[PDB]
Design a protein around this ligand. Structure first.
Ligand SMILES: CC(=O)Nc1cc(Oc2ccc3c(c2)CCN3C(=O)Nc2ccc(CN3CCN(C)CC3)c(C(F)(F)F)c2)ncn1
Length: 274
């Protein structure tokens, strides 16, 4: 389906210790045309990394939704001794980058449209019995001003720490569930309403709350103790009380009391419609 000889490099997109992503053009007709795609490569095809990459491909082959990144196929390069994953190319990259780079195009109505789409993608993911774990605007991608798609770059498998999106039971017991994805969704909703303004990010805000000078495990200790006793990210400037209430309800230490993604999509769509 994707012959390496016809997969032409266009641009580097992202790199980490685990993998890298590039933009390519798939030109089988060899006439300088063809579809543009995003291609993920494994940096080191060890038995464990390759098993993990194959599990990712299997997950992606099972997902088809408007608000989930679109799998296209695989390419077997280096004479069929290397594996690359082919996805649809999304021009605006991560929603974290888009919010910073394209503030001219964003208002609260757009933020709520993206919020709704994220909930719907998560409703779908739950029907497939997957737990995201990594929900954060860095892992949501933007097709255009009207459409976002949940993904998981998985390139890097305090400012760079994923802990600031994790539910308290995930931090203390490594318990990840649909309900902890709801907690992380509450952090995504906070990220959207802070517009990725300098110093308002979840890592910067939590570090400010615990003490900016803390390093290593002391950060973890303080974050856990803070969350267990009702410490929370503040309401972003200009955020409506009703939107901060959705964040607060997602950030419930009582796991079963968190709303569902179906509840959240309906609530957000009703606020948009009213
Ligand atoms: C400008 C620009 O850079 N444009 C780009 C970049 C770009 O780069 C990407 C972005 C995302 C992804 C790739 C490449 C290759 C794979 N990938 C990706 O999202 N994988 C993925 C892996 C697991 C899971 C779901 N699992 C469930 C189990 N969990 C434990 C983990 C998550 C999902 C999800 F969340 F269901 F969509 C997605 N793609 C399109 N356009």
């Amino acid at each position: 389906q994707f012959e390496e000889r016809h997969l032409k490099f266009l641009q580097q997109l992202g790199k980490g210790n685990f993998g890298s992503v590039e933009m390519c053009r798939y030109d089988p007709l060899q006439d300088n045309t063809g579809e543009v795609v995003a291609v993920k490569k494994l940096q080191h095809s060890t038995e464990e990394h390759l098993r993990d990459f194959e599990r990712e491909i299997e997950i992606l082959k099972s997902l088809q939704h408007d608000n989930i990144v679109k799998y296209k196929g695989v390419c077997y390069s280096a004479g069929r001794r290397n594996l690359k994953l082919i996805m649809e190319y999304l021009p605006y990259g991560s929603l974290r980058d888009y919010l910073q780079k394209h503030k001219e195009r964003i208002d609260h109505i757009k933020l709520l449209q993206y919020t709704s789409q994220i909930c719907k993608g998560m409703e779908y993911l739950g029907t497939k019995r997957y737990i995201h774990r990594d929900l954060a605007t860095r892992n949501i991608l933007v097709e255009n001003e009207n459409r976002v798609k949940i993904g998981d770059f998985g390139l890097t498998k305090p400012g760079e720490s994923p802990i600031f999106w994790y539910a308290p039971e995930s931090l203390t017991e490594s318990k990840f569930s649909v309900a902890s994805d709801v907690w992380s969704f509450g952090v995504v909703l906070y990220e959207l309403f802070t517009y990725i303004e300098k110093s308002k990010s979840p890592p910067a805000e939590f570090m400010r709350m615990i003490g900016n000078d803390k390093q290593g495990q002391m950060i973890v200790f303080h974050l856990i103790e803070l969350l267990k006793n009702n410490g929370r990210l503040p309401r972003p400037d200009g955020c409506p009380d009703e939107i901060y209430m959705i964040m607060t309800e997602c950030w419930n230490n009582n796991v079963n009391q968190r709303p569902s993604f179906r509840d959240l999509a309906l609530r957000v769509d009703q606020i948009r419609d009213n």
